[PDB]
Amino acid sequence: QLKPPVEAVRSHYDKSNEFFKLWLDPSMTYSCAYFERPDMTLEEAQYAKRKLALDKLNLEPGMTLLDIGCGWGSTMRHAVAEYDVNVIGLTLSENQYAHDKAMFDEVDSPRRKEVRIQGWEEFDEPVDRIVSLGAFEHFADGAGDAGFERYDTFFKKFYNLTPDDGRMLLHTITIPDKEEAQELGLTSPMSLLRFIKFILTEIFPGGRLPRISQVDYYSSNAGWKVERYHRIGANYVPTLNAWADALQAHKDEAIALKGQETCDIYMHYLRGCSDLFRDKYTDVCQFTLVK
Amino acid sequence: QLKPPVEAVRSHYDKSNEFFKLWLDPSMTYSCAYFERPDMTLEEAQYAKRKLALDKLNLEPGMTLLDIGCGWGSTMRHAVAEYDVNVIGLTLSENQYAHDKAMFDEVDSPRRKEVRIQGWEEFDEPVDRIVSLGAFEHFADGAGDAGFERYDTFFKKFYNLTPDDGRMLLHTITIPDKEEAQELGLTSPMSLLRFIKFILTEIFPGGRLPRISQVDYYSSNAGWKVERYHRIGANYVPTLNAWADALQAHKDEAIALKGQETCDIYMHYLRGCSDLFRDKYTDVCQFTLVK
Ligand SMILES: CCCCCCCCNCCCCCCCC
Ligand SMILES: CCCCCCCCNCCCCCCCC
């Protein structure tokens, strides 16, 4: 069976918790926010995003929630606080794991709070609901076994680990399908091609963005149905600008911490990606998957 | 002023003359062929391509021809033989220079035969005609001063080094303009994006493909007029398949020579690029530039 893209993932997310601390919001949510109201700060928007997702799971207290690619815990920690469920978080980052583990010590609840350095490929317990925010772009990747063919194992797996009322909220960056790209009038100048290369080179090695039809094909092949396609990628512009701005604001702390080049790399990364979503070149979609 | 992309260029073209010898035609022409007649071998097609270009220069004997990015000499060596002009060749490859230099010893003529390790940025003599086949994609590159803004220096320079009847045959891979890409129905799946990244990573670091309108803008800004746009990119499929096939044919010699990975890399490179032109994602154009 499958090998998790450990080293690829670690090269990014294990860059330094203090480094990310500088420019992420306070909840350290590392995925597209949700400006449900025009006046939310970034941090309130991250809450709104977490909420928005968790609400779709029809969670009841006592249930077990699996969070795949649980980042820095915000989603788990929020799922317990606001829903009273037990949570299991999957991550491949040592830093993220270290931090979620400690962040758990703080607040208390009769609910289970587990973070693991485990891949979805290796998970094998029964759960009630599933959430994954901004991790999916790594699932087509593997320790030398990459391929969208992997989505197939994925959806069939977690269809089988969940009850008959089982639900999955898959939140992920996407790219337009043939028909829709044409319809958008999308075009790929040389600057853009250089950028993606830069991204796949300096930021997210082995990352693969799905087309909605890919998520359909493999999900339904497993028996899933999409109760909703919530396209919300426009929110990534405010998000990404916020991150970029904060990083710039801490330019001197950041150069002090992980170096000159990295400020440049990440500023370039953050500024650049903003435009991708501005231009509708990329999107973010939240699939509500049911049986 | 400008610094030539020496190390970027050397990383590719200085891979090994024996290595390229294995799969290039016998003239070792490293650019899109021209199957002027359906039955030409690759080698005859390279001649047809060289001819096709040189014919546009209205060369007379005694004239001086500058070949920019003269590759492995085929164009120079052909320009003397069939036109009786003196030739200067510019290259940044040590291997290419070594080889053209020796290849010159062989055949003889009262005509000057010069190959130099010099950039177009550094050239400063007067010439009658100018040819450049498959080098142009490196002109927007520089030793830390890349940018299409460079084309401006280029065209203004060689407008000034040539007489009033001066002509330039610019032969280069291109990419579609906005309007035309849309019209072609072009689309950039993830596989394609991964590929370009692979290309700009493992094959042609810093390479930049022009849009026809870019060549127009900068050329005319210098005073040039395009007497013809000869689009001939479809020929690159036969060319690239030929190269790929030959390399495969010599798989064992090649693995013996520069290693396992490199056979893989270059097979992947060659096979892959073929499709780019098959799909009209990229093109090849020959600009006849006049005053
Ligand atoms: C080529 C795509 C690489 C895979 C995407 C990994 C993003 C994982 N989410 C957390 C970070 C989101 C940063 C925004 C990415 C925008 C492009
Ligand atoms: C991203 C583009 C890189 C710059 C192009 C350099 C090609 C210089 N010609 C000689 C080699 C031609 C090989 C075919 C290239 C097809 C893509």
Residues 6+ apart with CB under 8 A from B59: B65, B79, B83, B85, B128, B129
Residue from the list A194, A208, A209 with its beta carbon closest to the beta carbon of B200: A194
- Which string of DSSP letters, residue by residue, matches B62-114? T-EEEEET-TTSHHHHHHHHHH--EEEEEE--HHHHHHHHHHHHHS--SS-EE
In contact, B172 and B136? CB cutoff 8 Å: yes
Q: Is A181 in Cβ contact with B187 (below 8 Å)?
A: yes
CA distance to A14, A262, B19, B82, B195, per residue, from B45 (Å): 53, 48, 21, 16, 28
Closest chain B CA to residue A176: B189
Please indicate whether residue B209, judged by its CB atom, sits closer than 6 Å to ligand 2.
Answer: yes
Which candidate, A131, A162, A152, places its Cα nearest to that of A291?
A: A162
Sheet holding A167-174, edge to edge: A113-117, A86-91, A64-68, A129-133, A167-174, A283-290, A225-231
Q: Do B196 and A201 touch (CB under 8 A)?
A: no
Q: Hunting for tokens 């991708």 — which residue is that?
A: A276
Distance A197 CA to ligand 2 centre (A): 16
Q: Which residues of A134-172 are buried (b: 16+ CB within 10 A; e: fewer)?
A: bbbbbbbbbeeebebebbebbbebbbeebeeebbbbbbb
- Gap between the Cα atoms of A191 and B142, Å rounded: 16
Question: Do A17 and A95 form a contact (C-beta atoms < 8 A)?
Answer: yes
Query: Which of A212, A209, A177, A235 lies closest to A289, judged by CA?
Result: A212
A265, A38 contact by CB (below 8 A): no
Residue A59 near residue A75, CB atoms below 8 Å:
no
Give residue A254's identity as a one-letter amino acid code: A
Q: Do A197 and B194 touch (CB under 8 A)?
A: no
CATH number of the domain at B23, please. 3.40.50.150
Nearest residue to A152 via CA among A90, A215, A209, A67: A215
Out of A178, A189, A190, closest to residue B187 by CB: A178
A174 vs A45: CA distance, rounded Å: 20
Q: What distance in angstroms lies between residue A207's CA and the mean position of ligand 1's atoms?
A: 8
Whether residues A188 and B181 touch (CB distance < 8 A) is answered with yes
Burial class (CB in 10 A: 0-12, 13-18, 19+), A39: exposed
- Would you say A32 and A284 are in contact if contact means Cβ atoms under 8 Å apart? yes
| SS3 letters across chain A | CCCCCHHHHHHHHCCCHHHHHHHCCCCCCCCCCCCCCCCCCHHHHHHHHHHHHHHCCCCCCCCEEEEECCCCCHHHHHHHHHHCCEEEEEECCHHHHHHHHHHHHHCCCCCCEEEEECCHHHCCCCCCEEEEECCHHHCCCCCCCCCCCHHHHHHHHHHHCCCCCCEEEEEEEECCCHHHHHHHCCCCCHHHHHHHHHHHHHHCCCCCCCCHHHHHHHHHHHCCEEEEEEECHHHHHHHHHHHHHHHHHCHHHHHHHHCHHHHHHHHHHHHHHHHHHHCCCCEEEEEEEEC
Nearest to B188 by CA among A249, A83, A177: A177
Beta strands B64-68 and A167-174 are unpaired
Chain A residue numbers touching B200 (CB-CB < 8 A): 193-194, 197
Q: How far is CA B99 from the centre of its chain?
A: 17
A221-259 b/e (C-beta count within 10 Å ≥ 16 → b): ebebebeeeeebbebbbbbbebbbebbeebeebbeebbe
- Angle CA(A86)–CA(A88)–CA(A92) in degrees, nearest 5? 160
Q: In b/e form, how buried is each residue of B200-228, taking b as 16+ CB within 10 angstroms? A: bebbbbbbbbbbbebbbebbeebebebee
Phi, psi (5° rounding) for residue A105? -50, -50
B197 within 8 A of B271, measured Cβ to Cβ: no
Q: Do residues B161 and B126 make contact, with C-beta atoms less than 8 angstroms apart?
A: yes
The answer, yes or no, to whether any atom of ligand 2 lies below 6 A from the CB of B204, is yes
Closest Cα in chain B, distance from residue A234 (Å): 21
Phi, psi (deg, nearest 5) at residue A143: -70, 75
User: Of B150, B161, B273, B156, whose CA–CA distance to B214 is shortest?
Assistant: B150
* A115 in Cβ contact with A76 (< 8 Å): yes
In chain B, what's the furthest Cα-to-Cα distance? 55
Tokens of B265: 């890399």
Q: Which two tokens stand for residue B47?
A: 């001649």
User: CA-to-CA distance for A88 and A123, rounded, in angstroms?
Assistant: 10
Report the C-alpha gap between A221 and A155 in whole angstroms: 8
Please state, in angstroms and rounded to a whole number, the distance separating the CA atoms of residues A164 and A160. 9
Calpha distance B53→B85 (Å, rounded): 15
* Chain A residues within an 8 Å CB radius of B185: 182
Q: Quick one: tokens of B180?
A: 């035309």
Closest-CA distance, B138 to chain A, in angstroms, reads 13
Residue B247 CA to residue B245 CA, distance in Å, equals 5
Q: Name the nearest CA neighbour of A58 among A81, A89, A83, A87.
A: A83
Q: How far apart are CA B59 and CA B214, in angstroms?
A: 27
Q: By C-alpha distance, which of A268, A209, A207 is closest to A243?
A: A268
As a whole number of angstroms, the distance between CA A138 and CA A205 comes to 9
Domain count, chain B: 1
Contact predicate B92/B116, CB 8 Å: no
* Encoded tokens for A7: 């080293």
How far, CA to CA in Å, does B64 sit from each of B71, B113, B166, B171, B253? Answer: 18, 10, 11, 19, 40
- Tell me, yes or no, if A263 is annotated catalytic: no
Which domain does B23 fall in, by range? Answer: 1-291
- Token pair in block for residue B193: 């994006």
Residue nearest to atom 4 of ligand 2 (CA): B207
Q: Check A190 against B208: CB less than 8 A apart.
A: yes
Say if residues A185 and A253 touch (Cβ distance below 8 Å).
no
Place of tokens 């994609």: B137
What's the rounded Cα separation, in Å, for the pair B275 and B268? 11
Contacts of B1 (CB under 8 A, 6+ apart): B121, B153
| Two tokens, residue A156 | 């069939």
**How far, in Å, CA of B215 to CA of B155, rounded?**
9
Q: B76, B96, B85, B170: which is closest to B127 by C-alpha?
A: B85
Are the C-beta atoms of residues B130 and B65 closer than 8 Å to each other?
yes
Residue A230 makes CB contacts below 8 A (sequence gap 6+) with: A285, A286, A287, A288
Is the separation of the CB atoms in A239 and A134 below 8 Å?
no
> What is the spatial distance between Cα A32 and Cα A236, in angstroms, rounded to a whole number?
5
B181 → chain A, closest CA residue: A187
Closest by alpha carbon to B56, among B232, B172, B234, B230? Answer: B230
**DSSP code string of chain B:** -----HHHHHHHHTS-HHHHHHHS-TT---S----SSTT--HHHHHHHHHHHHHHTTT--TT-EEEEET-TTSHHHHHHHHHH--EEEEEE--HHHHHHHHHHHHHS--SS-EEEEE--GGG-----SEEEEES-GGGTT--SS---TTHHHHHHHHHHHSS-TT-EEEEEEEE---HHHHHHHT----HHHHHHHHHIIIII-TT--PPPHHHHHHHHHHHT-EEEEEEE-GGGHHHHHHHHHHHHHHTHHHHHHHH-HHHHHHHHHHHHHHHHHHHTTSSEEEEEEEE-
Q: Which residues line ligand 1 (CB under 6 A)?
A: A 30-31, 134, 137, 173, 199-200, 204, 207, 209, 273
Phi/psi at B231 (nearest 5 deg)?
A: -85, 125
**Experimental method for this entry?**
X-ray
